[PDB]
């Protein structure tokens, strides 16, 4: 009953500061413009100890499956090849991505009826709000 309140299908409803986050990450102009337009659906499921997060949009369809605390390799939607580790910290899913000596953290939290996603790169934070589909 690990992660029960995250499971389901979620749709992006608002975003703030995501272009600046993507700049901080090193995403180029054209990818930023197309990615910034996307309205993804985030589909979260659990089977035993394995969590799957799918992100589907007109920009890209991605899928990750993982066990909490167990590193995995991920190709991100913007084509970074990263080493990722996802843990649960006080009810928040914390996703750390490492590549080229850099690091970014993506937090997913349940707040009221929303799933709030915070993406942080250095001093730049972006908040993306998802609602149930
Ligand atoms: C952590 O995600 C990113 C970081 C940098 C650049 C892009 C992304 N990924 C996205 C951006 C917009 C819409 C959907 C996604 C997705 O992942 O499906």
PDB file of C-alpha atoms and ligand atoms in Angstrom:
ATOM      1  CA  UNK A   1       0.000   0.000   0.000  1.00  0.00           C
ATOM      2  CA  UNK A   2       3.166   1.646  -0.930  1.00  0.00           C
ATOM      3  CA  UNK A   3       2.265   4.555  -2.865  1.00  0.00           C
ATOM      4  CA  UNK A   4      -1.490   4.078  -2.859  1.00  0.00           C
ATOM      5  CA  UNK A   5      -2.387   7.727  -2.942  1.00  0.00           C
ATOM      6  CA  UNK A   6      -0.131   8.243  -6.040  1.00  0.00           C
ATOM      7  CA  UNK A   7      -1.606   5.436  -8.134  1.00  0.00           C
ATOM      8  CA  UNK A   8      -3.819   6.462 -11.003  1.00  0.00           C
ATOM      9  CA  UNK A   9      -3.961   8.598 -14.113  1.00  0.00           C
ATOM     10  CA  UNK A  10      -3.162  12.274 -13.716  1.00  0.00           C
ATOM     11  CA  UNK A  11      -3.297  15.202 -16.171  1.00  0.00           C
ATOM     12  CA  UNK A  12      -1.165  18.400 -16.144  1.00  0.00           C
ATOM     13  CA  UNK A  13      -3.237  21.461 -15.260  1.00  0.00           C
ATOM     14  CA  UNK A  14      -0.714  24.187 -14.434  1.00  0.00           C
ATOM     15  CA  UNK A  15       2.968  24.884 -14.661  1.00  0.00           C
ATOM     16  CA  UNK A  16       5.211  27.605 -13.336  1.00  0.00           C
ATOM     17  CA  UNK A  17       8.884  28.337 -14.112  1.00  0.00           C
ATOM     18  CA  UNK A  18       9.363  25.193 -16.217  1.00  0.00           C
ATOM     19  CA  UNK A  19      11.167  26.987 -19.070  1.00  0.00           C
ATOM     20  CA  UNK A  20      13.693  28.375 -16.610  1.00  0.00           C
ATOM     21  CA  UNK A  21      14.095  24.954 -14.992  1.00  0.00           C
ATOM     22  CA  UNK A  22      14.723  23.404 -18.406  1.00  0.00           C
ATOM     23  CA  UNK A  23      17.294  26.173 -19.185  1.00  0.00           C
ATOM     24  CA  UNK A  24      19.067  25.398 -15.908  1.00  0.00           C
ATOM     25  CA  UNK A  25      19.140  21.693 -16.831  1.00  0.00           C
ATOM     26  CA  UNK A  26      20.690  22.547 -20.234  1.00  0.00           C
ATOM     27  CA  UNK A  27      17.755  21.834 -22.532  1.00  0.00           C
ATOM     28  CA  UNK A  28      18.063  23.552 -25.918  1.00  0.00           C
ATOM     29  CA  UNK A  29      15.674  26.072 -27.434  1.00  0.00           C
ATOM     30  CA  UNK A  30      13.608  23.875 -29.722  1.00  0.00           C
ATOM     31  CA  UNK A  31      13.105  21.103 -27.153  1.00  0.00           C
ATOM     32  CA  UNK A  32      12.147  23.670 -24.540  1.00  0.00           C
ATOM     33  CA  UNK A  33       9.484  25.183 -26.758  1.00  0.00           C
ATOM     34  CA  UNK A  34       7.895  21.866 -27.726  1.00  0.00           C
ATOM     35  CA  UNK A  35       8.222  20.323 -24.277  1.00  0.00           C
ATOM     36  CA  UNK A  36       6.842  23.418 -22.636  1.00  0.00           C
ATOM     37  CA  UNK A  37       3.636  23.138 -24.714  1.00  0.00           C
ATOM     38  CA  UNK A  38       2.971  19.540 -23.687  1.00  0.00           C
ATOM     39  CA  UNK A  39       0.089  18.583 -21.415  1.00  0.00           C
ATOM     40  CA  UNK A  40       1.208  15.152 -20.235  1.00  0.00           C
ATOM     41  CA  UNK A  41      -0.735  12.415 -18.596  1.00  0.00           C
ATOM     42  CA  UNK A  42       1.241  10.812 -15.747  1.00  0.00           C
ATOM     43  CA  UNK A  43       0.144   7.198 -15.088  1.00  0.00           C
ATOM     44  CA  UNK A  44       1.401   5.671 -11.858  1.00  0.00           C
ATOM     45  CA  UNK A  45       0.972   2.009 -10.942  1.00  0.00           C
ATOM     46  CA  UNK A  46       2.407  -0.469  -8.464  1.00  0.00           C
ATOM     47  CA  UNK A  47       2.848  -4.236  -8.774  1.00  0.00           C
ATOM     48  CA  UNK A  48       4.571  -5.745  -5.736  1.00  0.00           C
ATOM     49  CA  UNK A  49       7.710  -3.711  -5.061  1.00  0.00           C
ATOM     50  CA  UNK A  50       7.856  -2.356  -8.610  1.00  0.00           C
ATOM     51  CA  UNK A  51       6.527   1.150  -9.270  1.00  0.00           C
ATOM     52  CA  UNK A  52       5.878   2.233 -12.873  1.00  0.00           C
ATOM     53  CA  UNK A  53       5.525   5.858 -13.935  1.00  0.00           C
ATOM     54  CA  UNK A  54       4.458   6.535 -17.521  1.00  0.00           C
ATOM     55  CA  UNK A  55       4.389  10.119 -18.942  1.00  0.00           C
ATOM     56  CA  UNK A  56       2.507  10.507 -22.219  1.00  0.00           C
ATOM     57  CA  UNK A  57       2.090  13.550 -24.344  1.00  0.00           C
ATOM     58  CA  UNK A  58       2.353  14.837 -27.867  1.00  0.00           C
ATOM     59  CA  UNK A  59       6.037  15.644 -27.061  1.00  0.00           C
ATOM     60  CA  UNK A  60       7.174  12.236 -25.832  1.00  0.00           C
ATOM     61  CA  UNK A  61       5.962   8.977 -24.300  1.00  0.00           C
ATOM     62  CA  UNK A  62       8.215   7.697 -21.540  1.00  0.00           C
ATOM     63  CA  UNK A  63       8.079   4.909 -19.004  1.00  0.00           C
ATOM     64  CA  UNK A  64      10.177   4.084 -15.949  1.00  0.00           C
ATOM     65  CA  UNK A  65       9.908   1.105 -13.624  1.00  0.00           C
ATOM     66  CA  UNK A  66      11.883   0.905 -10.417  1.00  0.00           C
ATOM     67  CA  UNK A  67      12.199  -0.333  -6.854  1.00  0.00           C
ATOM     68  CA  UNK A  68      12.539   2.322  -4.154  1.00  0.00           C
ATOM     69  CA  UNK A  69      16.162   3.010  -3.261  1.00  0.00           C
ATOM     70  CA  UNK A  70      17.550   0.953  -6.189  1.00  0.00           C
ATOM     71  CA  UNK A  71      19.361   2.952  -8.894  1.00  0.00           C
ATOM     72  CA  UNK A  72      18.466   2.573 -12.538  1.00  0.00           C
ATOM     73  CA  UNK A  73      19.481   4.065 -15.831  1.00  0.00           C
ATOM     74  CA  UNK A  74      16.794   6.407 -17.477  1.00  0.00           C
ATOM     75  CA  UNK A  75      16.767   8.248 -20.863  1.00  0.00           C
ATOM     76  CA  UNK A  76      14.772  11.363 -20.040  1.00  0.00           C
ATOM     77  CA  UNK A  77      12.211  12.966 -22.343  1.00  0.00           C
ATOM     78  CA  UNK A  78      14.808  15.587 -23.329  1.00  0.00           C
ATOM     79  CA  UNK A  79      17.307  12.774 -24.183  1.00  0.00           C
ATOM     80  CA  UNK A  80      19.645  12.940 -21.189  1.00  0.00           C
ATOM     81  CA  UNK A  81      21.172   9.621 -20.171  1.00  0.00           C
ATOM     82  CA  UNK A  82      20.937   9.714 -16.426  1.00  0.00           C
ATOM     83  CA  UNK A  83      21.363   7.512 -13.374  1.00  0.00           C
ATOM     84  CA  UNK A  84      18.230   7.759 -11.242  1.00  0.00           C
ATOM     85  CA  UNK A  85      17.261   6.804  -7.726  1.00  0.00           C
ATOM     86  CA  UNK A  86      13.723   7.193  -6.378  1.00  0.00           C
ATOM     87  CA  UNK A  87      12.902   6.978  -2.677  1.00  0.00           C
ATOM     88  CA  UNK A  88       9.938   7.747  -0.437  1.00  0.00           C
ATOM     89  CA  UNK A  89      10.783  10.469   2.203  1.00  0.00           C
ATOM     90  CA  UNK A  90       8.070  11.291   4.529  1.00  0.00           C
ATOM     91  CA  UNK A  91       5.356  10.412   2.006  1.00  0.00           C
ATOM     92  CA  UNK A  92       7.053  12.311  -0.884  1.00  0.00           C
ATOM     93  CA  UNK A  93       8.498  10.448  -3.898  1.00  0.00           C
ATOM     94  CA  UNK A  94      11.973  11.921  -4.388  1.00  0.00           C
ATOM     95  CA  UNK A  95      13.603  11.264  -7.796  1.00  0.00           C
ATOM     96  CA  UNK A  96      17.279  12.207  -8.126  1.00  0.00           C
ATOM     97  CA  UNK A  97      18.923  12.177 -11.580  1.00  0.00           C
ATOM     98  CA  UNK A  98      22.718  12.278 -12.013  1.00  0.00           C
ATOM     99  CA  UNK A  99      24.526  12.923 -15.307  1.00  0.00           C
ATOM    100  CA  UNK A 100      27.721  14.650 -16.409  1.00  0.00           C
ATOM    101  CA  UNK A 101      28.586  15.676 -12.867  1.00  0.00           C
ATOM    102  CA  UNK A 102      25.175  17.435 -12.536  1.00  0.00           C
ATOM    103  CA  UNK A 103      22.123  16.570 -10.448  1.00  0.00           C
ATOM    104  CA  UNK A 104      18.424  17.438 -10.449  1.00  0.00           C
ATOM    105  CA  UNK A 105      15.638  16.403  -8.124  1.00  0.00           C
ATOM    106  CA  UNK A 106      11.964  15.839  -8.962  1.00  0.00           C
ATOM    107  CA  UNK A 107       9.553  15.543  -6.015  1.00  0.00           C
ATOM    108  CA  UNK A 108       6.008  14.230  -6.333  1.00  0.00           C
ATOM    109  CA  UNK A 109       3.574  14.884  -3.481  1.00  0.00           C
ATOM    110  CA  UNK A 110      -0.125  14.476  -2.876  1.00  0.00           C
ATOM    111  CA  UNK A 111      -1.756  17.698  -1.778  1.00  0.00           C
ATOM    112  CA  UNK A 112      -5.536  17.774  -1.492  1.00  0.00           C
ATOM    113  CA  UNK A 113      -6.831  16.229  -4.711  1.00  0.00           C
ATOM    114  CA  UNK A 114      -3.696  17.159  -6.665  1.00  0.00           C
ATOM    115  CA  UNK A 115      -0.368  15.600  -7.384  1.00  0.00           C
ATOM    116  CA  UNK A 116       2.206  18.382  -7.161  1.00  0.00           C
ATOM    117  CA  UNK A 117       5.532  17.957  -8.974  1.00  0.00           C
ATOM    118  CA  UNK A 118       8.506  20.123  -7.970  1.00  0.00           C
ATOM    119  CA  UNK A 119      11.554  20.082 -10.236  1.00  0.00           C
ATOM    120  CA  UNK A 120      14.733  21.641  -8.829  1.00  0.00           C
ATOM    121  CA  UNK A 121      18.030  22.377 -10.539  1.00  0.00           C
ATOM    122  CA  UNK A 122      20.402  24.436  -8.400  1.00  0.00           C
ATOM    123  CA  UNK A 123      18.441  27.577  -7.291  1.00  0.00           C
ATOM    124  CA  UNK A 124      15.681  27.122  -9.908  1.00  0.00           C
ATOM    125  CA  UNK A 125      12.420  25.425  -8.976  1.00  0.00           C
ATOM    126  CA  UNK A 126       9.414  24.650 -11.149  1.00  0.00           C
ATOM    127  CA  UNK A 127       6.041  23.556  -9.840  1.00  0.00           C
ATOM    128  CA  UNK A 128       3.686  21.511 -12.001  1.00  0.00           C
ATOM    129  CA  UNK A 129       0.213  20.609 -10.783  1.00  0.00           C
ATOM    130  CA  UNK A 130      -1.605  17.473 -11.918  1.00  0.00           C
ATOM    131  CA  UNK A 131      -5.288  16.539 -11.343  1.00  0.00           C
ATOM    132  CA  UNK A 132      -6.994  13.154 -11.679  1.00  0.00           C
ATOM    133  CA  UNK A 133      -7.854  12.402 -15.284  1.00  0.00           C
TER     134      UNK A 133
HETATM  135  C1  LIG B   1      11.911  15.767 -15.787  1.00  0.00           C
HETATM  136  O1  LIG B   1      11.392  16.034 -16.989  1.00  0.00           O
HETATM  137  C2  LIG B   1      12.007  16.919 -17.902  1.00  0.00           C
HETATM  138  C3  LIG B   1      13.145  17.683 -17.702  1.00  0.00           C
HETATM  139  C4  LIG B   1      13.641  18.503 -18.738  1.00  0.00           C
HETATM  140  C5  LIG B   1      12.987  18.601 -19.943  1.00  0.00           C
HETATM  141  C6  LIG B   1      11.843  17.858 -20.120  1.00  0.00           C
HETATM  142  C7  LIG B   1      11.357  17.056 -19.121  1.00  0.00           C
HETATM  143  N1  LIG B   1      10.258  16.224 -19.373  1.00  0.00           N
HETATM  144  C8  LIG B   1       9.001  16.682 -19.780  1.00  0.00           C
HETATM  145  C9  LIG B   1       8.784  17.983 -20.133  1.00  0.00           C
HETATM  146  C10 LIG B   1       7.511  18.438 -20.463  1.00  0.00           C
HETATM  147  C11 LIG B   1       6.506  17.592 -20.561  1.00  0.00           C
HETATM  148  C12 LIG B   1       6.686  16.281 -20.309  1.00  0.00           C
HETATM  149  C13 LIG B   1       7.924  15.758 -19.856  1.00  0.00           C
HETATM  150  C14 LIG B   1       8.019  14.303 -19.626  1.00  0.00           C
HETATM  151  O2  LIG B   1       8.969  13.943 -18.904  1.00  0.00           O
HETATM  152  O3  LIG B   1       7.129  13.548 -20.115  1.00  0.00           O
END
